[PDB]
Amino acid sequence: MFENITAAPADPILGLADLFRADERPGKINLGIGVYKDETGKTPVLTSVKKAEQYLLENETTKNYLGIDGIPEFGRCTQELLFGKGSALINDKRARTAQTPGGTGALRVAADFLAKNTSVKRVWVSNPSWPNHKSVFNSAGLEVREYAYYDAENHTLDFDALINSLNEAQAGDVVLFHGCCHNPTGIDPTLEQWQTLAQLSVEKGWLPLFDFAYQGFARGLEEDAEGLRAFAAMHKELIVASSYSKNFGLYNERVGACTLVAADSETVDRAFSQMKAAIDANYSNPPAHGASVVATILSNDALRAIWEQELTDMRQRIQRMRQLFVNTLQEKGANRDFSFIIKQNGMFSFSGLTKEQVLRLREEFGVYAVASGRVNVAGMTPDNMAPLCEAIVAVL
Amino acid sequence: MFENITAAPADPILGLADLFRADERPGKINLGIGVYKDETGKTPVLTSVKKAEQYLLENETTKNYLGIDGIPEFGRCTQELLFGKGSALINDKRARTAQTPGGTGALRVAADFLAKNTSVKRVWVSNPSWPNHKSVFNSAGLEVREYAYYDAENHTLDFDALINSLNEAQAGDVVLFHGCCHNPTGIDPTLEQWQTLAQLSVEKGWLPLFDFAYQGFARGLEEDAEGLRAFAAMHKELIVASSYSKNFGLYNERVGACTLVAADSETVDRAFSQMKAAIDANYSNPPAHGASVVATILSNDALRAIWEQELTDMRQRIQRMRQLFVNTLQEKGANRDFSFIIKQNGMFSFSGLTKEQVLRLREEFGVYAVASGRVNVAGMTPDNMAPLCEAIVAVL
């Protein structure tokens, strides 16, 4: 029935870093770990986090249902975080926002709501893509269509190619644009480059969707939130599926947003009254906690000032691990240009470790990087650099 | 596109109690409010709640991603809450559990996972049904099929009728059984009565699903969790989609479970490895908070002992409002037998207020009960009884 003749074959969190406990090793680190990690390789409760949580405990008098759209401040600031300021999408009210359990959990929200109401059948992808994006897309119809993103060799973005096999298929066809920077590649489009495909998405029907997981990680937070803004006062209709789990260190309590910015007020009202609709049908109403905690910081003149900064270093640290990794090669290695990393936004970079390198790695080297030469510059440590940079130059 | 030729017509939280602020009234209460409310008609942060939350704040060192299945204790106790003890479904390991954002959010989980893997096309319903169950069901295929539940007149359960037009359609057809007691009706099957349809679901293919939102509200918690247990060491395959939001007063932080109890270990493993699968595709991984907080109480010998009891009175209070409502009529009213309530589990009862009674109610009476003669015995107060019981006997 249900019973047998069931497949199994699960999501590869596990392509790496699980049984890292493994065969009782002296192993350095786990690299290609998604989440962020310090010089002790710890995943902490910020401070901001906790200083806001103190608030709640004593201030919260009701764990009563939170609205279907979650909370409205969470939005108003989500909103001015995204693209806004005093800025008119906010004042046009061309923008209407949703409290979603994750950005992951605001990307399917995007699916099943756009399946119906909207004339969507396909989702144009990116390659390499964050592969939980092929999956959550056929979660309610649709199909993903993986265009040309990274062109290998000189480890960068192909615009020659992307602007070719993306360009392709039909007017009511959507894409989901990728923030500042990428997964698995750390690669991005420049505002020159992006601004340039904004007018080309204005001119081909298209109609965007964006995955905004990392603001102020390796570009800035605001200029890194402008590679969206390129589009924002350009389009008419679009959507942002955003997170707080990377920049707030709030992975577990589930928070993101589903901002549909339709062309009016009254439109943005109903294209969304149906966006309103979706929520109910699974998890009617969002969780409060991490959500509460994102609005609260922003609110306290002296709490976000401490968050923004607690964010700054989560970066300084990433940006650090790049320049370091590479010194450790020019300084150590002297082989190939290990170069290209530093100048790629995020914690992710697509190492050029063609596959069974990444394998004659997990042994008598007890080292982990997820198959695609995909590493976490986040779990790349000062104390962890040296050991690593030996086992790279050994594997070549 | 998305833009216009969008419908709107939203979920009627709103069939009542929103604009209750309304036309500047002296109005009593809002009755038919779902959530629970005290003698001050407040929706509180229990104590248990907060005493567990103190724990977390200081004890929690990571807001790092929670597993896709959420936490395992949450399950192990969910598990022994459900049906277990030292009891073998637990030790057969015929049962395998999921941390879900709600029971609402563990009922679609049930849908899209059973759509595929499993040979399901229809969901047999109940009438009156909790109407967020027609909706979240066509959320990924399927169709609901509303059998005979309540037969009106002498305001009870029809077994004559239910055992007739439920019985009907085909072997790979499922139902979702309704806990102890009901929504909107407060009506239940007895263990004699239920035990009697257990062997008749064993004999017709069928294969259950249960909605377990209210344990220990107007039957007991355990005997009220046995009207499941009737089935549990009966079936082979089934599922429970449970909540903590009513019994934990944790509406907002989102918690429930998705317990698939397949016939073995290795089966329960894969019919579920696909149950494992679903989670990812929307909200990969559950929120921690309220989830954390449910396991923690159970754990502390002296914290659940305080929760179980904080639960006891949330009931004493409901059970109170029944006997009272009715005194207030025999004592006040003297008309019809207002009787039937007290002896119906939960906070809900299906008042016999045929529709435009419930309407020549919301005026110069400023009173609210959601259309179907559907009231909250939870928002029925001592100070609120008298006023109410005047406007009933006035409307007849």
From Swiss-Prot, chains A, B:
Induction: Transcription is increased specifically in response to 2,4,6-trinitrotoluene (TNT) and its indicator compounds 1,3-DNB, 2,4-DNT, and 2,6-DNT. Its cofactor is pyridoxal 5'-phosphate. Changing Y65 to F/S: Slight changes in activity. CDD domains: AAT_like (cd00609). It catalyses: L-aspartate + 2-oxoglutarate = oxaloacetate + L-glutamate. It is found in: Cytoplasm. Its main location: cytoplasm. One of its GO terms (biological process) is L-phenylalanine biosynthetic process. GO terms for molecular function: identical protein binding; L-aspartate:2-oxoglutarate aminotransferase activity; L-tyrosine-2-oxoglutarate transaminase activity; protein homodimerization activity; pyridoxal phosphate binding. The modification N6-(pyridoxal phosphate)lysine is found at K246. Keywords: Aminotransferase, Cytoplasm, Pyridoxal phosphate, Transferase. InterPro entries: Aminotransferase_I/II_large, Asp_trans, NHTrfase_class1_PyrdxlP-BS, PyrdxlP-dep_Trfase, PyrdxlP-dep_Trfase_major, PyrdxlP-dep_Trfase_small. Belongs to the class-I pyridoxal-phosphate-dependent aminotransferase family. Homodimer. This is Aspartate aminotransferase.
